[PDB]
Amino acid sequence: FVEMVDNLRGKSGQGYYVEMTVGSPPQTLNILVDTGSSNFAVGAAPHPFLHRYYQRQLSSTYRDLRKGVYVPYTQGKWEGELGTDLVSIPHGPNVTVRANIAAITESDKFFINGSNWEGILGLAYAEIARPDDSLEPFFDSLVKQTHVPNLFSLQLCGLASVGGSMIIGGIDHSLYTGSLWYTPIRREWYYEVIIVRVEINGQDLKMDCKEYNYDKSIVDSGTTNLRLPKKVFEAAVKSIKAASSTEKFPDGFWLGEQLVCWQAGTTPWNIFPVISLYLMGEVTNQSFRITILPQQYLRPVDCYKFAISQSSTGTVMGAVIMEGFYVVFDRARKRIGFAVSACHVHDEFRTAAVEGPFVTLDMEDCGYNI
Ligand SMILES: Cc1cccnc1-c1ccc2nc(N)c(C[C@@H](C)C(=O)NCCC(C)(C)C)cc2c1
C-alpha cells in the first residue's frame, strides 16, 4: 500500500490529519483522523483560524439533508448543517464515495489557532454519531459502496512536525516488527477494549481489574495522553513517583502543571520506568502485553511534559500508547491488533514491546457493566 505510507501529518499535540477532497469539483481539506468519534465534520465558514473551508455553493454533487446537528463537548462545541457529497482520499484508495458531511457553521474551542486542519474524520461506530446512530459514518459508507476491505491501520510516529500512515483497507507489514497480537473489540461504539493487568517496571498495580476499565477503555487517535480512571491514575503515579525517586520533581509535574528540563541530550531516560498494559487476548485465559517507554509518556513542549492524566470517562489509549505501535482496527473481525512500530522513539537500552501469550484468569470480570 505504498501510495498510503506517510499520508499523515500534524504538529505535536495538535493531532494527525490526512488530506481529503469533498465535492465536485474536488475541494482539498486537511482532516483530523479520530478513532474516538464518528462524525465527518468540516469547517464551512470563514473562521479566522482556518486555512480553507468547504464551500457547498461550488459543488454540483452536494445534497442538503435539511437537518442541523449540535455537538457540545466538556469545553466547547461545534454546530452545523447536515448534507452528503462525494468524498475521496488522494493518498488513500482509488475510490470516491457519497458520505455524510456536517458543514460546521458555528463553533467554540474546536478549531485550533495556528493548526493546519479544517475538519475531523470520526472513524468509530454509528452508536456514538451525532445526532444519532442513523447518520452513517464515513468508513461505513466507504465499505458499503466500494470493495475496500473493512479494516484500517494506523502508524502514528511521534511546534515540531509529526508524521504517520493511515492504511485504508489493509495492513502494510513494513510498518511493524514482530507479530501482531489481537484484543477483541468488546462492543462496537468506541473502539472499546479490556485491560486485564497493569505493571510499572514489571510491578503489578494489584488493583481489581474492573478499575482499569471503569467505565470503559478505548483506543483513540484523537487524544494525546494516556488517560486513566482517577483511582488507577493515583495508584499509577504513586508507583511511577517511587520508581523514579533517585531524582525528585515538584508534585505539580505529575499533575501536568509544569515542565521538567535537562541540558540538551542528557534526559535521564533510564530512571523512568516502563508501563505495561496487558490486554484481553483472542483465546480464553490468554492475554498479551504492550509496553511503552518514558519516550512515549514524557512529551516535548530539552523540556518535557508528563502525558499521563486522570479521567472520569475511562482509560483512553491516545497517542502516548499509539506512537509505540502499529495499530490494526480489524473491524471485519471485531478486533484490534498491536505490533511494535517500525517508527517508534526509543533508546539503546529499551524499546516498546508487544509480547505473549500470558496466562490471565477471570478476564471477563474486568469489563464494566451498568
Ligand atoms: C465536539 C468537540 C467540540 C469542541 C472541542 N472538541 C470536540 C471534540 C471533537 C472530537 C473529539 N474526539 C475525541 N476522540 C475526544 C476524546 C474522546 C475520549 C471523546 O470524548 N470522544 C467523544 C467525542 C464526541 C462524540 C465528538 C463528543 C474528544 C473530542 C472532542
Curated annotation (Swiss-Prot):
The record describes its membrane topology as:
Single-pass type I membrane protein
Which one of the record's GO molecular function terms can you name? endopeptidase activity
Q: Which cysteines are joined by disulfide bonds?
A: 157-343, 209-366, 261-303
Q: Do you know what upregulates this one? A: Up-regulated by the Ca(2+)-regulated transcription factor NFATC4.
- Positions bearing N6-acetyllysine: 67, 206, 210, 216, 230-231, 238
Keywords for the protein's UniProt record, in alphabetical order: Acetylation, Aspartyl protease, Cell membrane, Cell projection, Cytoplasmic vesicle, Disulfide bond, Endoplasmic reticulum, Endosome, Glycoprotein, Golgi apparatus, Hydrolase, Isopeptide bond, Lipoprotein, Lysosome, Membrane, Palmitate, Phosphoprotein, Protease, Signal, Transmembrane, Transmembrane helix, Ubl conjugation, Zymogen
- Tissue distribution of the protein: Expressed at high levels in the brain and pancreas. In the brain, expression is highest in the substantia nigra, locus coruleus and medulla oblongata.
Q: Which residues lie on this side of the membrane: Extracellular?
A: 1-370
Q: What are its GO biological-process terms?
A: amyloid fibril formation; amyloid precursor protein catabolic process; amyloid-beta formation; amyloid-beta metabolic process; cellular response to amyloid-beta; cellular response to copper ion; cellular response to manganese ion; detection of mechanical stimulus involved in sensory perception of pain
Q: Which reaction does it catalyse?
A: Broad endopeptidase specificity. Cleaves Glu-Val-Asn-Leu-|-Asp-Ala-Glu-Phe in the Swedish variant of Alzheimer's amyloid precursor protein
- PTM details? N-Glycosylated. Addition of a bisecting N-acetylglucosamine by MGAT3 blocks lysosomal targeting, further degradation and is required for maintaining stability under stress conditions.
> Which Gene Ontology cellular component terms are annotated?
axon; cell surface; dendrite; early endosome; endoplasmic reticulum lumen; endosome; endosome membrane; Golgi apparatus
Description of activity control: Inhibited by RTN3 and RTN4.
Identify the catalytic residues: 34, 220
The EC category is hydrolase
Glycosylation-annotated residues: 94, 113, 285
Which Enzyme Commission number(s) are on file for it? 3.4.23.46
In the record's own words, the domains note is: DXXLL motif is required for a proper endocytosis and retrograde transport to the trans-Golgi network, as well as for regulation of lysosomal degradation. The transmembrane domain is necessary for its activity. It determines its late Golgi localization and access to its substrate, APP.
Which family is this protein grouped under?
Answer: Belongs to the peptidase A1 family.
What protein name is recorded for this chain? Beta-secretase 1
List the source organism.
Homo sapiens (Human)
